[PDB]
Amino acid sequence: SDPKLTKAVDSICDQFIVTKSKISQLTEYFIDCMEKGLEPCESDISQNKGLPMIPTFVTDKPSGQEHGVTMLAADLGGTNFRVCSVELLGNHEFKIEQEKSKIPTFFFQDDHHVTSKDLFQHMALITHQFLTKHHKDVIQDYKWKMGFTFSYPVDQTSLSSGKLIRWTKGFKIGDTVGQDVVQLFQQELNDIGLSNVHVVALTNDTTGTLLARCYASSDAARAINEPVIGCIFGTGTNGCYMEKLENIHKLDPASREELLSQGKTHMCINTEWGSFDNELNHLPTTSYDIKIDQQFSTNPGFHLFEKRVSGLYLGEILRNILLDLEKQELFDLKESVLKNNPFILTTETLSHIEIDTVENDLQDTRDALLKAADLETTFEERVLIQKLVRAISRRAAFLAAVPIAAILIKTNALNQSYHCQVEVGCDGSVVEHYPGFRSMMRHALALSPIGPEGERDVHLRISKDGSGVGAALCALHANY
């Protein structure tokens, strides 16, 4: 027991407190940023520091009765790449064949040069392998339609076109920025004899999450649970929603009028809320967050909301806290390997600490810290490390509720029919598996302007779109 270490920890934990008044302020500011982000910016989209609010050119929420021939789907995340074939049977049913593979660490390192051709050649070959394994009998001329789920910010110009704005989540491929990722992918498919495979749709992982949940939600569930948000809380964080065409002022007025005359009323918006308040006008900030953004992040000055929320960064926050406590001569790092190893403490490490119990002398915390960075600890040190972890995760979960509450308020989403609630489709390892993260998001929602009664009308449902149904639904609509 070191009373000076205990007070230092309690003081740092206080730096992560998010009050009811703060949530209200951030919710209000988020809506302002939404409206600003819906206006056209005559600057560079890569220079823009506001809330991107990217039109996805998706205008229809699936009913569940969509059906068609087998579609192809490719899904590039922050960790895995998947190729799938999806047969939409209507009636909320589908057949899926998929192959999942980790993204090689080769694409995340700077010691050797990585090019766009490396990435998209790798993706085209995986596609070729999938088609050889699961659809060998299909003619080599078959007119495959493919939907491409690309979980990165894209300057979407149509359903099938858009240029990469900037990488995130540790990806470092310099020459992809400013390039149309559908063309890059299509060219590599062409080069290996798969020119008959046409990438006809491009969706963000938020967009796919919303569409897939709209299609799969049964008639009974859909009756009293209306999916209004598809969002992600994993390596990164983001969410989408349906905005009135009239409010999407950055959209060409002729395109708006054309869509309106076709009977459309809304278009899905990829908010890219990981980049909420990149200027830090209001986001809770500690010295540890600044250090992560400026020194250890791949995109300094951008995606600052994500750096306080998503799983890529929560462990790194703890590392910088322990390093600061060592400089203060309060914590003995012993023979650990924390120093000079950014991101060696993972959110997976924290997940073993969050609900560890003192009845077992916090043995899971000890093992996790030894396994991660060879950090020996005493019981008393683990008690304080647990406090730090819980403050980090609570702030992350409280902030995670802000974009959702803001969207629900701006769109008046809680105004529905009798008994009908709003469903927020959630995917990602943090919201799904980090113990207590969902419970704290719900607490924060109850504290937000929607109040406890609004939170009861909100269903944070784990809804995974890892099978490519979201991309498949977009490809089904598009023309070959």
List residues near a copy of itself by CB under 8 A: 220, 223-224, 354-355, 357, 390, 417-421, 433, 435-436, 439, 442-443, 446, 452-453, 455-457
Give the nearest distance from C-beta 442 to a copy of itself in angstroms: 5
152 lines the binding site for ligand MAN (CB under 6 A): yes
- For residue 365, the Cα-to-chain-centroid distance in whole angstroms is 27
Task: Dig out the tokens for 302 from the structure.
Answer: 């951008």
465 appears as a binding residue in the annotation? yes
The smaller minimum CB distance to ligand MAN, of residues 306 and 455, is found at 306
d(CA 21, CA 1): 35
* Partner whose footprint covers residue 365, from a copy of itself, ligand MAN, none (CB < 5 to 8 Å by kind): none
* Partner whose footprint covers residue 151, from ligand MAN, a copy of itself, none (CB < 5 to 8 Å by kind): ligand MAN
* Partner whose footprint covers residue 357, from a copy of itself, ligand MAN, none (CB < 5 to 8 Å by kind): a copy of itself
**Which of 60, 82, 116, 151 is labelled catalytic?**
151
The three-state DSSP-derived secondary structure of 391-429 is HHHHHHHHHHHHHHHHHHHHCCCCCCCCCCEEEEEEECH
Give the nearest distance from C-beta 400 to ligand MAN in angstroms: 12
Is 393 one of the annotated active-site residues of the chain? no
Adjacent-strand bridge partners of 103: none
d(CA 301, CA 288): 14
The smaller minimum CB distance to a copy of itself, of residues 22 and 433, is found at 433
Among 33, 123, 232, 304, binds ligand MAN (CB under 6 A): 232
DSSP letter for each residue of 147-205? EEEE-S-EEEEETTEEEE----TT---GGGTTSBHHHHHHHHHHHTT-TTEEEEEEE-H
Is 166 one of the annotated active-site residues of the chain? yes
DSSP assigned state of 38: T
**Residue 206 CB burial class (10 angstroms; 0-12, 13-18, ≥19):** buried
205 lines the binding site for ligand MAN (CB under 6 A): yes
Give the nearest distance from C-beta 324 to a copy of itself in angstroms: 25
Q: What pairing do the DSSP bridges indicate for beta strands 421-427 and 144-150?
A: unpaired
* Partner whose footprint covers residue 355, from ligand MAN, a copy of itself, none (CB < 5 to 8 Å by kind): a copy of itself
Give the nearest distance from C-beta 409 to ligand MAN in angstroms: 22
467 appears as a binding residue in the annotation? yes
Among 121, 149, 204, 217, binds ligand MAN (CB under 6 A): 204
470 appears as a binding residue in the annotation? yes
What is the three-class DSSP state of 449?
A: coil
d(CA 310, CA 314): 7
Here's the x/- map for ligand MAN, 287-326, by CB under 6 A: it reads as: ----------------x--x--------------------
DSSP assigned state of 40: P
* Partner whose footprint covers residue 152, from ligand MAN, a copy of itself, none (CB < 5 to 8 Å by kind): ligand MAN
Give the nearest distance from C-beta 2 to ligand MAN in angstroms: 39
469 appears as a binding residue in the annotation? yes
Q: Which residue is nearest to ligand MAN (CB)?
A: 236
DSSP letter for each residue of 278-345? TT-SSS---HHHHHIIIII-SSTTS-TTGGGTSHHHHHHHHHHHHHHHHHTTSS--TT-S-TT-TT-S
**Which of 46, 161, 166, 175 is labelled catalytic?**
166
100 appears as a binding residue in the annotation? yes
Residue type, 326: E
195 appears as a binding residue in the annotation? no
Among residues 290, 247, 215, the alpha carbon closest in space to that of 40 is found at 247
Among 37, 62, 274, 454, binds ligand MAN (CB under 6 A): 274
Is 217 one of the annotated active-site residues of the chain? no
* Partner whose footprint covers residue 435, from a copy of itself, ligand MAN, none (CB < 5 to 8 Å by kind): a copy of itself
* Partner whose footprint covers residue 274, from ligand MAN, a copy of itself, none (CB < 5 to 8 Å by kind): ligand MAN
What's the sign of the alpha-carbon dihedral 310, 61, 446, 353? negative
Judge contact between 391 and 16, C-beta under 8 A.
yes
CA distances, 50 to each of 47, 223, 224 (Å): 9, 36, 35
Judge contact between 283 and 12, C-beta under 8 A.
no
230 lines the binding site for ligand MAN (CB under 6 A): no
Annotated binding site: 100, 465-470
Residues involved in catalysis: 151, 166, 205
Q: Which residues bind ligand MAN (CB under 6 A)?
A: 78, 151-153, 168-169, 204-206, 232, 234, 236-238, 272, 274, 303, 306
